[PDB]
């Protein structure tokens, strides 16, 4: 009948779901091995990080010049915009900031360049010439030297030691100059690492593309293996940005217990210089140092630390502002890169099995379902 049409197509339905479901049930055996390789590649890169700040191959002179060329074509294009919005002071100021940073990026690359032409020389901790940046503590030039009065180091214009060792003021600005120079070199190193890692990552792009196009499924799956490596390098870049930011006192490292800490290795969190880690029963939120979070009647409020319920209890729009302010926190990731990766790993591992079973049932049901539409049609 009508019914026969609606019964055959009531099993046309069921074999549509015997197949797009059995698709998922080995395609997940799939994705979990993917998940396995992904976190393995990630952890390798993370473990290999410290052992890369010291042992990475340097930027070639060619790479240095090429990255300086690129920055210059950015400083050029920056001024063009600066003189397009001439008069709009608040964007001209914005672009001046962007232009100043590039300028400083370039002064750093120039040090690297000057050392391949030296021009400048690398020097250890402290005084003596070295050949490799990994060994360098300072980069100085031809009319400067490092003297080591006791366990205390000094950076001065060459020869002028005698005009110095009897004036403490000048003993001081030269033990200061020394420090500032060690600092600047550290900055240069992190940026160099970042540039080096960037170049390496950009190169993998052509490759990844090919493996994707490749009709051979064996090659296709190899693009995913390679993406993991690509992203592993990105984990390293992220650490460096975080380090640079802390190094520049834009940010702060904190350990598991929200104690401020100096080094990445001890850090579980990384947040703004003017922020704190606020606890909401077993979870840290990055907020301003002079803010707090108040809970009342299952509601949450971000307020100045002065404020409390009384401050806003008669103001409705205050309350809603403090709730939107709190709501913006929700997807903040104050965690350190390594920590985030471990966090994400637990979340994905959990959810994978929560898709192992649900789909397994979804197949069990669709074969139970088979015993009904086979039943009806054989009538």
């Amino acid at each position: 009948l009508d019914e026969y049409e609606q019964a055959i197509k009531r099993a046309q339905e069921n074999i549509k779901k015997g197949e797009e479901l059995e698709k998922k049930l080995d395609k997940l055996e799939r994705q979990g091995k993917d998940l396995e390789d992904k976190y393995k590649t990630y952890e390798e890169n993370l473990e290999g990080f410290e052992k890369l700040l010291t042992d990475s191959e340097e930027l070639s002179l060619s790479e240095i010049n090429e990255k300086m060329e690129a920055f210059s074509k950015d400083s050029e294009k920056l001024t063009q915009l600066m003189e397009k919005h001439k008069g709009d002071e608040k964007t001209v100021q914005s672009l001046q900031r962007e232009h100043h940073d590039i300028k400083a990026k370039l002064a750093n690359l120039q040090v690297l360049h000057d050392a391949h032409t030296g021009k400048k020389s690398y020097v250890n901790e402290k005084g003596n010439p070295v050949s490799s940046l990994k060994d360098a503590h300072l980069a100085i030039n031809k009319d400067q030297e490092v003297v080591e009065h006791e366990g205390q180091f000094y950076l001065l214009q060459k020869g002028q030691w005698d005009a110095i060792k009897n004036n403490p003021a000048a003993l001081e600005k030269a033990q200061k100059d020394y420090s500032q120079s060690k600092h600047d070199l550290a900055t240069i190193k992190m940026e160099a690492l970042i540039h080096k890692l960037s170049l390496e990552m950009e190169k993998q792009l052509e490759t990844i593309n090919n493996l994707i196009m490749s009709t051979d499924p064996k090659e296709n799956e190899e693009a995913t293996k390679l993406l993991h490596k690509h992203n592993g390098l990105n984990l390293k870049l992220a650490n460096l940005q975080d380090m640079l930011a802390v190094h520049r006192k834009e940010k702060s490292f904190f350990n598991e217990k929200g104690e401020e800490v100096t080094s990445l290795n001890d850090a579980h969190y990384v947040i703004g210089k003017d922020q704190q880690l606020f606890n909401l029963g077993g979870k840290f939120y990055p907020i301003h140092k002079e803010q707090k979070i108040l809970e009342k009647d299952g509601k949450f409020y971000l307020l100045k630390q002065g404020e409390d319920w009384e401050s806003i209890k008669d103001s409705p729009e205050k309350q809603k502002k403090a709730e939107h302010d709190f709501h913006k926190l929700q997807y903040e990731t104050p965690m350190t890169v390594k920590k985030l990766v471990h966090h994400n790993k637990g979340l994905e591992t959990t959810i994978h099995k929560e898709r192992v079973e649900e789909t397994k049932q979804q197949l069990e049901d669709n074969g139970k379902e088979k015993i009904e539409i086979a039943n009806n049609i054989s009538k």
Partner: protein, 170 residues
């Protein structure tokens, strides 16, 4: 058969990984799993009796993860710029995303703006009109989406594909 490469960009938290997963697997997960770097999904749709394979690329929203994001602009045919209607900053930042693209992606790339999480009017901070105003200032299509409720997600991708097939057919 055509083959378009699509790029999702936008601040962390706005829902890029989620609209991707709704369009590609028709699934949504509330659990925040922040994106560490690029990956892609694949979906073949049908426009004008012709197959269109969509190769769709997710990116990392967190600043520390976007050092080389401009390098991904290469050979993107379309770019969805995503923000969160319940987060004004994420919306303000679209200006910068847009600029960054003008400077680093071909002037030819197709661009759609998506105000995601439109299923959360109880926490809205950006008016749908501010949305379309912005999109009109820049001359790019616009649309409010929800990856949770599956609102306008097929829509957004079909439209963007359309505008590429258009320009490409001719």
């Amino acid at each position: 058969d055509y083959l378009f490469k699509l790029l999702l960009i936008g601040d962390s938290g706005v829902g890029k990984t989620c609209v991707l997963f709704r369009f590609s697997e028709d699934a949504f997960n509330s659990t925040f799993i922040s994106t560490i770097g690029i990956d892609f999904k694949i979906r073949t749709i049908e426009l004008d009796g012709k197959r269109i394979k969509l190769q769709i690329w997710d990116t990392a929203g967190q600043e520390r993860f976007r050092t080389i994001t401009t390098a991904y602009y290469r050979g993107a045919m379309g770019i969805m710029l995503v923000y969160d209607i319940t987060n004004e900053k994420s919306f303000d930042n679209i200006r910068n995303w847009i600029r960054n693209i003008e400077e680093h992606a071909s002037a030819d790339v197709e661009k759609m703006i998506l105000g995601n999480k439109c299923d959360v009017n109880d926490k809205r901070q950006v008016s749908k009109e501010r949305g379309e105003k912005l999109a009109l200032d820049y001359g790019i299509k616009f649309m409010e989406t929800s990856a949770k409720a599956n609102i306008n997600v097929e829509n957004a991708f079909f439209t963007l594909a359309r505008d590429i097939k258009a320009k490409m057919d001719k």
